[PDB]
């Protein structure tokens, strides 16, 4: 407990995350330009409308690949458990900035875990429906009816994921100190105590204990 | 664009900013294809390509007279052949296939690019290529599987109802060329009249289910057929029975959009009013007092 | 005097203010796109030029309604008085960051009050001339000559208000600590002492006094 910060995120997972964010900006905006044609400016997300049509799916694939790297590195820390119920029941209290008083928060809270699975499920849905509606490469192999359903679902999934990310960014901006941890990798012990009690308690113990195990 | 000022529908255009359409007092036109008089000569395929300056590849024979085997960016109309005994004796049903120029076009409804597809006051539905992004949404939106992408420029093409001829007073190339007069052209009102007269004659010859194919599900079409067996359109190489814009496409291009719009606006409001109402969540809101 | 902050703005007036700001961004930019056609990008403020023509006046009306709510809640604190003269005479000194030395500043200073009435007068002018030039709904009822004058005046008023807001934003960015008070609602006592002496003195007295009135 004698250090201003503690490492919350490794460089590799920070590099990935911000790669996903940049790709997502382009993919979400191009997608929105097809969804709401009145927002003409967005048809220039990838330069020209013709270019955007081509690149959207490629950058989409990149996001999926990167999110799968994130999946295998973060999933075990996002597993729902009985300790998450307390959170789910005092949501209104958590949003007022009083979560500590009402819940048991480990590495990532119950909201972050719900977001994680929402994000991971939607990118899978977007991958599958995206491939199906992809011309000229793949749409040809699918029955027209399947292509039609996929067009409906892909649009819906894309919108759901964008809403989710809006909320994910907000929260990140809201629980102050969070963005620095994702850019630099470190969180101050007090930030850990307030927003993620159980989690820091574990690092603190893992820490001290194994250093006490050495035999100072 | 809009030089003709008679554009009644335009793709990806908000309903409160309609396209220029003051010059809309024009009679609707229509092509009537009487399959009972068609001899499957393919003159229409040839005349179409000659007039339109397009040439498909030299294909292969795989056991049937049909060729090319499907519509493509270089073949805007193709004759489809069907041999059947479903009605009691051998029949060779031959049907000219290509854009139906629907009154309520699914291609235009599904298209996400402003102005890529338009509908003229006279009923012609045409592609304005400068605006096409090659997404292919129109292929799925079309109840008749008509649009085809050109690999060489990433744009879709199809029968234009010879808009370049009709616009200045002349009938389409395929219409004029038809050896037996199976294809007719004129105002839709008089083509419907000719169709009913023909149906009456077919009934008098024993075809009790002869009828006009002008599907109400798409608001009627500007390319219609007279069929010996209107009760079984599938017999004519899969012509759809009671075609309509698919329900999934209607929902996707319809209600989903404003719903998503409301969610977005409402979400932005909520988050903004939330931040302002409660304030940031920093490490210590307590030692600030 | 034993609290880091003091409430300067209620939530209701903060919510309104930022609603006005968002609407103003859209209305000002669309208006500018008609004023300076060479700035083509601004014709997409509301998606398309055709849409912008339609929406500009509607969002304009919303701004007026919201500013009238602001008018009835802030006017009494913006009333010019003899104590404002000192300000008006050492403007050059105030701009150098030395206002405290030269003036008597209450809730809002003499500059803020001038801005307030400028903003409130212009939105009234914009409302009236705006309605007059509004097609298809209202312009038809007005004599062509009145419509013409209204087109000239509306453009002029709109430009004046945009200049005013530019200055209003700058000042807000300049007298540090100000934006937080409008977003969160609180100002630190020292910020109150330096920029608004008389004002905090009044809260301080109202405060202490009524708590001393209770009978500790
Ligand atoms: C509280 C709840 C409030 C509820 C309000 C619901 C409104 C629904 C309006 C509408 O859809 O009716 C549509 C109505 C009917 O249109 P329609 O022809 O039947 O069909 C629409 C088109 O088919 C296809 O749809 P569309 O393309 O025409 O969509 C319309 C709308 C489309 O815009 C929207 O729907 C909302 C905008 C959402 C943008 C999403 C951004 C997300 C991206 C983020 C990614 C970040 C990445 C992280 C990295 O575009 C325009 O109308 C102008 C809106 C401009 C908003 C500008 C905001 C900038 C602020 C910046 C500061 O159109 C309109 O009347 C004018 C609507 C005006 C709304 C104000
Ligand atoms: C997982 C990989 C993805 C693939 C293969 C993919 C593929 C596609 C394709 C082929 C289209 C049709 C237009 C075009 O050809 O450009 C499309 C549309 C779209 N995509 Fe994706 N996409 C992917 C990911 C995403 C993601 C992550 C989002 C959300 C940010 C998204 C949102 C959209 C939207 C909103 C549309 C337009 C639907 C409409 O017109 O209503 N896509 N995508
Ligand atoms: C500019 C926008 C974004 C910001 C500021 C942001 C910020 C953050 C921060 C600060 C964290 C870690 C918080 C903590 O340490 O508890 C985080 C985690 C994460 N972010 Fe983002 N992010 C953004 C966009 C995205 C996007 C577009 C995606 C994917 C579509 C994404 C996926 C994730 C995932 C999967 C995690 C791990 C969370 C968990 O394991 O529960 N982020 N983000
Ligand atoms: C009070 C409510 C308002 C109404 C009813 C209104 C209405 C209008 C109308 C009808 C037009 C003509 C174009 C069109 O139909 O879109 C217009 C133009 C304009 N408005 Fe407004 N407006 C309002 C507020 C404002 C405000 C607050 C501003 C300043 C930010 C503004 C700045 C402009 C400008 C610069 C123009 C274009 C004049 C030119 O072409 O030189 N308007 N407004
Ligand atoms: C992004 C741009 C803006 C910023 C940063 C901003 C910031 C502020 C701040 C910090 C205050 C209160 C200062 C204090 O507590 O003494 C304030 C007050 C005010 N603002 Fe803004 N503002 C912006 C835009 C606008 C707009 C567009 C309008 C209306 C057209 C507006 C109208 C007002 C009014 C009426 C007041 C109350 C002032 C008084 O009563 O004298 N503001 N603004
Ligand atoms: S030209 Fe006429 S007769 Fe010949 S195949 Fe075409 S529609 Fe039939
Ligand atoms: S047949 Fe298909 S391509 Fe032709 S107008 Fe109808 S929906 Fe569009
Ligand atoms: S391919 Fe079809 S749906 Fe896509 S922009 Fe071109 S005409 Fe529109
Ligand atoms: S109407 Fe013109 S474009 Fe259409 S099939 Fe006939 S010849 Fe070709």
Description:
Chain B: The chain crosses the membrane at residues 256-278. Chain B: [4Fe-4S] cluster 1 binds at residues 38, 41, 44, 178. Chain B: Residues 29-57, 90-122, 123-152, 157-188 form the 4Fe-4S ferredoxin-type domain. Chain B: This is Formate dehydrogenase, nitrate-inducible, iron-sulfur subunit. Chain B: Its cofactor is [4Fe-4S] cluster. The structure is cut from a larger assembly and holds two copies of chain A (216 residues) and one copy of chain B (289 residues). With 216 residues, chain A is an all-alpha fold. Chain A has a single domain, classed as Fumarate Reductase Cytochrome B subunit (Up-down Bundle), CATH 1.20.950.20. Helices cover 69% and strands 3% of the residues of chain A. In chain A, strands 1-2 form a two-stranded antiparallel sheet. The longest helix of chain A has 31 residues, at 144-174. The two termini of chain A are 17 Å apart. In chain A, 31% of the residues are buried. Chain B has three domains: 1-26 and 98-161, Alpha-Beta Plaits (2-Layer Sandwich), CATH 3.30.70; 27-97 and 162-227, Alpha-Beta Plaits, CATH 3.30.70; 246-289, Single helix bin (Single alpha-helices involved in coiled-coils or other helix-helix interfaces, Up-down Bundle), CATH 1.20.5. Chain B is 26% helix and 17% strand. Chain B has eight helices and eleven strands. Chain B starts with 6 loop residues before the first strand and ends in an 11-residue tail after the last helix. Chains A and B meet through helix 2, helix 7 and helix 9 of A and helix 3, helix 7 and helix 8 of B.
